[PDB]
Design a binder for this molecule. Structure first.
Ligand SMILES: Nc1ncnc2c1ncn2[C@@H]1O[C@H](COP(=O)(O)OP(=O)(O)O)[C@@H](O)[C@H]1O
Ligand code: BEF
Ligand SMILES: [Mg+2]
Lengths: 65, 607, 445, 9
DNA sequence: ATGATATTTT
DNA sequence: AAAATATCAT
């Protein structure tokens, strides 16, 4: 019996790797790796990683002007 | 802009609001909108007066985007220069544009066309025995030109090497240089007797394109842009025949040089006595009084080291004065060294023929003062409807990258990054499935791959042939001929060598597992390889063009940037996230996790 | 939808309130027109007969084929309490509501109506010049504020408060601004008649203690009045609500006399095209809309580039669709707006493609598509990008002494639909924050 | 148009 | 400015 | 089979 507050993140394999890389840069982002398709992240950093993900993928999109 | 109330939502348009001008009473008839500030033109192709409007706008404007219904044109100084060149004046242009405009032409636009429509014919350049004389009938204007230190009835001989310098300078000064050659008048240069064979017939658009070059009855230099498979070879052959002078052809590749030789023979009356090919395979030169000489850019452009045997032929090329010169694949002329071909060879009329007038750098515009203005252009969609170029249903398959593969992608460096997604196991399965599915339909498939290592790896696994630089000329020709006329060999891989300037009607489908960096030229050229399929007039036929990419990788960024030219011309790309029937395939490469790991180690060992 | 949405609202009204509502003949006529066509047939027959009629006879009136329609008609009448059933002597008799019957009869024939329809003053005003312009300006102003585009004039405080309380066009104080939600865009798509009732119904719900019956009577009466022909100013609550309608543009007052507006007539019932646009495979948009509203609404999810008097041209970009989706608009709405306003040329070209496809293989039939497939697919894919990563708020439970306890907790969480993830091998499971309290309470017990 | 179908692999 | 790929020559 | 010069993209 132990409750740990956190945020559940379900995503595709590619997004999971990006989240882990972000956690490597900042160890306080992700809390646990629940599964290859599920991760536990600190609620305070949920927005940061959410915004960060949309920035990293921006490199893969060709913005016209 | 006077006595006009700004709109409430005018703030949405960043000073581009054009509501001050009032719509004409007969706006339901006029097919053109003219944007004053930007100079853009919006044309309705579904309204009356569409056909002749498109012909007129193309003459006075360079097309930007031509979708099915609304065509977006733009006016530039170079476009105006080309228009005034082909028997036109400001008075005619202004009257027609105002007549076709749904709204009155703004004063700013009127000034832009007016300025560049008067400098047409002040300065002329002619070529005598081997000396270039920049002369003019009048004597006062040239005196002003001569006073300038940059250049160094009046006629004066100018240094052959510095001809390009003055040509650009004339463009810089108000008066641009004109390139016209009255082939009928001069008979001193020996004349080649050649004519089109009785069986041959010129297609409508080919006839129109050649008519613009000879509109005034005298040949003028320029660039003719037709879609791949349109038949630019026949246009060049006809242009050479009418001039009735010595003709020299410069071509991108030796394989295409052979195509020009065969095509020239198949579609004209010329005999072998007057044909000689100055290529790497053989340096045979024609000894007749005059004839056709077909060579390649590398041989002519080379400056430092050329063999004596080639040197003698090169001296032969530079010796006699030529009447016509065809710069096939003129999209590479603006290269650093290939520009010398125009200067070294002295020809009165120079014609460029290419399908994709695209270049990453700003050197594409230089063509206007190296060869001539863009004389004519044709719509890819228009020819497709007429049945001249086979319809293609382009697609962009999305191949997700597996987790094990993806993790290694992030850590690796940029240059090593390319090999991770090009060798994506998911992409490999997609390529196998598409080839198997389209081979069932009895469709020839060409799989381009710029990366040589990936090209070989895919070919060896699939037990299929490949062509690239290491392959000798004899082997490359054998594969091409075999793949055209053998049932068993239905698919062949290729590389950057076959991207441009090769004819092969058999190919109908096409895939690209890997491609060069974002570059619209290669995408269009590869697509054109299957646009001349002989079975294009058959009812309900559609060729295919597949682009395999890896999701979340830099390939997605390049692919979107690599298909911009096709989108502008009209082609539309469809995203295929799921390939139905792939799971049921009994055998799929790298299905087991162990196979994926082994491949990952093998590809990683490369760098 | 008005034929059904208004009916649903009336049904929710209490029976006693409904009986009071039927007092005014004008409301009865409006309520008469909203009932199903078969219900109209039976009601009209019963209006002029002052006697009980058995339900069996009414069933005999209908043919065998139209039995389903009869079932719907009787259910609708019973729901609104129009038909009062009586069981006696083993017979089920049905009679019309005396209040509704008398009021409806008075409306049809010449009789006392207690001036429900109002009184004419014989002072007509040109509609094409003032009333139509006034109606358009008021509706134009309110809609502009809803779309979010800047506009100097501001809607009245009362209407502004209603929108704030209303679900559509959600406003956030923290952001300090007002934004359009999914409901707001749906309101824009809906026609003028649907939009008018959409606001009117919300106002009826908001009003508390202005009597509800008085407001409903005026609204139904407003439909009866024809454009122009001012009527003399009627309860006190009606007067204040009349002023509110004036702010909405439904009614025009010269300062004394109120002239009914064209929107009032439209409120009674139903009754190249303007606003149509062309979408190319190049993602460009050209809309032949000169109305200021059409440009503003299009700008919500389109990156405008230039404009002429005749038309406005723009282009769909990742920025435009991303902005609309972030606001709360779904990709389905975006395609729906583009398709409904398709240019005739696109429709003609699409029909030609369908005919050719049918000729090639008539065995397979596919729906007609007006917009190019690629543009639709790209918009849908862009929406999927936003939902690429999904984040949930909750708590994780692990470190269970016995596997049975973990299984029981996991099963309980799944039953109440609050379990987000579980794993028996690790004996861990993550639940939503909403169900955290329930799970904790269950664990304690 | 294939969007919602499972990704190939 | 560098790295791939291609081409020509010895 | 090894050299050397161009071309095309970062
Ligand atoms: N008038 C014509 N009639 C028949 N086939 C033609 C005609 N003109 C061109 N072709 C064919 O078009 C194909 C491609 O021509 P080519 O000149 O190689 O095209 P590109 O414009 O790509 O250089 C060849 O198979 C050629 O025979
Ligand atoms: F444009 Be072609 F294929 F030479
Ligand atoms: Mg060619």
């Amino acid at each position: 019996a132990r409750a740990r507050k956190g945020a559940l993140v379900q995503c595709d394999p590619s997004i999971k790797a990006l989240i882990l890389q972000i956690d490597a840069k900042m160890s306080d982002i992700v809390l646990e790796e629940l599964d290859d398709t599920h991760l536990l992240v600190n609620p305070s950093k949920v927005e940061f990683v959410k915004h960060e993900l949309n920035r990293l993928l921006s490199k893969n999109i060709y913005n016209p002007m | 802009p006077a006595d006009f109330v700004p709109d409430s939502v005018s703030g949405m348009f960043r000073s581009h609001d054009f509501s001050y001008l009032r719509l004409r009473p007969d706006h339901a008839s006029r097919p053109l909108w003219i944007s004053p500030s930007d100079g853009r033109i919006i044309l309705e192709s579904f309204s009356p007066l569409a056909e002749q409007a498109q012909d007129f706008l193309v003459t006075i404007a360079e097309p930007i985007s031509r979708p099915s219904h609304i065509h977006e044109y733009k006016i530039t100084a170079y476009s105006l220069y080309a228009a005034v060149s082909v028997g036109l004046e400001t008075d005619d242009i202004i009257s027609v544009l105002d007549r076709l405009s749904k709204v009155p032409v703004a004063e700013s636009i009127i000034n832009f066309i007016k300025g560049a429509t008067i400098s047409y014919g002040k300065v002329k350049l002619v070529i005598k025995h081997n000396r270039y004389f920049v002369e003019t009938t009048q004597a006062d204007i040239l005196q002003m030109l001569l006073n300038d230190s940059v250049i160094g009835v009046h006629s004066f001989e100018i240094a052959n090497e510095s001809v390009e310098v003055v040509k650009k300078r004339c463009q810089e000064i108000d008066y641009p240089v004109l390139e016209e050659y009255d082939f009928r008048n001069d008979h001193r240069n020996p004349d080649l007797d050649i004519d089109l064979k009785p069986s041959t017939q010129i297609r409508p658009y080919q006839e129109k394109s050649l008519s613009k070059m000879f509109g005034n009855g005298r040949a003028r230099s320029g660039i003719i842009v037709l879609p791949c498979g349109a038949g630019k070879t026949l246009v060049g052959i006809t242009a050479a025949c009418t001039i009735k002078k010595s003709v020299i052809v410069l071509c991108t590749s030796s394989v295409s040089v052979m195509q020009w030789r065969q095509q020239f023979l198949q579609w004209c009356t010329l005999q072998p006595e007057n044909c000689a090919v100055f290529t790497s395979d053989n340096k045979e030169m024609f000894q007749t009084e005059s004839g056709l000489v077909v060579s390649t850019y590398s041989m002519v452009a080379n400056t430092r080291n050329r063999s004596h045997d080639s040197q003698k032929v090169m001296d032969f090329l530079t010796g006699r004065e030529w009447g016509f010169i065809i710069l096939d694949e003129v999209h590479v002329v603006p290269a650093a060294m290939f520009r010398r071909v125009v200067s070294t060879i002295a020809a009165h009329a120079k014609l460029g023929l290419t399908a994709t007038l695209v270049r990453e750098d700003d050197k594409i515009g230089d063509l206007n003062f190296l060869i001539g203005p863009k004389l004519y252009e044709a719509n890819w969609m228009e020819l497709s409807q007429k049945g001249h170029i086979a319809n293609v249903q382009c697609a962009e398959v999305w191949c997700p990258m597996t987790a094990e593969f993806y993790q290694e992608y992030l850590r690796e460096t940029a240059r090593k990054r390319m090999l991770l997604y090009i060798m994506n196991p998911t992409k490999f399965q997609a390529c196998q499935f598409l080839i198997q599915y389209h081979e069932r339909r009895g469709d020839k498939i060409i799989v381009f791959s710029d990366n040589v290592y990936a090209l070989q790896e895919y070919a060896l696994k699939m037990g299929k042939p490949f062509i690239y630089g290491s392959t000798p000329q004899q082997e490359r020709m054998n594969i091409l001929q075999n793949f055209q006329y053998n049932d068993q060999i239905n698919t062949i891989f290729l590389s950057k060598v076959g991207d441009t300037s090769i004819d092969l009607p058999e190919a109908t489908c096409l895939i690209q597992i890997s491609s060069h960096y974002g570059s619209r030229r290669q995408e269009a050229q590869r697509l054109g390889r299957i646009l001349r399929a002989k079975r294009r007039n058959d009812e309900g036929f559609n060729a295919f063009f597949y682009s395999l990419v890896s999701k979340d990788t830099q390939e997605m960024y390049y692919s979107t940037k690599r298909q911009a030219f096709l989108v502008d011309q009209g082609y539309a790309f469809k995203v295929i996230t799921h390939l139905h029937g792939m799971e049921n395939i009994p055998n799929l490469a790298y299905a087991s996790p162990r196979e994926r790991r082994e491949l990952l180690q093998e590809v990683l060992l490369k760098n | 939808s008005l034929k059904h949405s208004v009916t649903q609202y009336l049904e929710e009204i209490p029976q006693q309130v409904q009986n009071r509502l039927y007092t005014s003949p004008a409301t009865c006529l409006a309520i008469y027109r909203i009932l199903p066509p078969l219900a109209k047939f039976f009601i009209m027959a019963m209006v002029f007969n002052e006697n009980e009629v058995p339900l069996l006879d009414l069933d005999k009136w209908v043919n065998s084929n139209g039995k389903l329609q009869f079932q719907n008609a009787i259910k609708s009448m019973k729901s609104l309490h129009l038909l009062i059933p009586n069981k006696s002597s083993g017979t089920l008799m049905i009679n019309l509501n005396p209040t509704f019957k008398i009021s409806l009869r008075n409306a049809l024939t010449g009789g006392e109506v207690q001036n429900s329809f109002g009184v004419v003053v014989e002072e007509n005003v040109v509609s094409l010049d003032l009333l139509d312009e006034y109606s358009a300006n008021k509706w134009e102003t309110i809609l502009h504020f809803m779309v979010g585009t800047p506009l100097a004039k501001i809607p009245s405080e009362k209407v502004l408060n209603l929108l704030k309380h209303s679900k559509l066009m959600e406003e956030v104080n923290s952001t300090g601004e007002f934004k359009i939600t999914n409901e707001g865009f749906q309101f824009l798509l809906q026609e003028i008649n649907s939009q008018l009732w959409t606001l009117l119904l919300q106002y009826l719900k908001m009003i508390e203690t202005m009597d509800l019956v008085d407001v409903l009577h005026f609204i139904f009466m407003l439909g009866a009045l024809e454009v122009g022909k001012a009527y003399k100013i009627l309860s006190e609550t009606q007067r204040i609500m009349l002023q509110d309608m004036r702010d909405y543009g439904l009614v025009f007052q010269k300062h004394s006399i109120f002239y009914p507006t064209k929107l009032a007539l439209m409120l009674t019932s139903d009754t190249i095209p303007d606003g149509s646009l062309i979408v190319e495979t190049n993602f460009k948009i050209y809309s032949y809309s000169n109305s200021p509203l059409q440009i503003a609404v299009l700008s919500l999810f389109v990156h405008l580039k230039a404009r002429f008097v005749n038309m406005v041209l723009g282009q769909i970009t990742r920025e435009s669709i991303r902005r609309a989706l972030t606001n709360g608009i779904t990709a389905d709405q975006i395609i729906a707006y583009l398709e409904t306003h398709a240019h005739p040329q696109m429709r003609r070209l699409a029909e030609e493609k369908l005919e050719k496809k049918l000729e090639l293989d008539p065995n397979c039939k596919e729906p007609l598509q007006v917009l190019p497939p690629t543009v639709v697919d790209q918009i849908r894919l862009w929406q999927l990008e936003l939902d690429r990563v999904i984040t949930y708020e909750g708590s994780l439970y692990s470190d269970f002494e016995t596997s049975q306890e973990y299984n029981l907790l996991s099963k309980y969480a799944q039953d109440i639909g609050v379990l987000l993830w579980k794993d028996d091998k690790k004996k861990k499971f993550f639940i939503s924050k909403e169900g955290n309290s329930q799970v904790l309470d269950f664990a304690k017990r | 148009s294939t969007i919602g179908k499972t990704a190939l692999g």
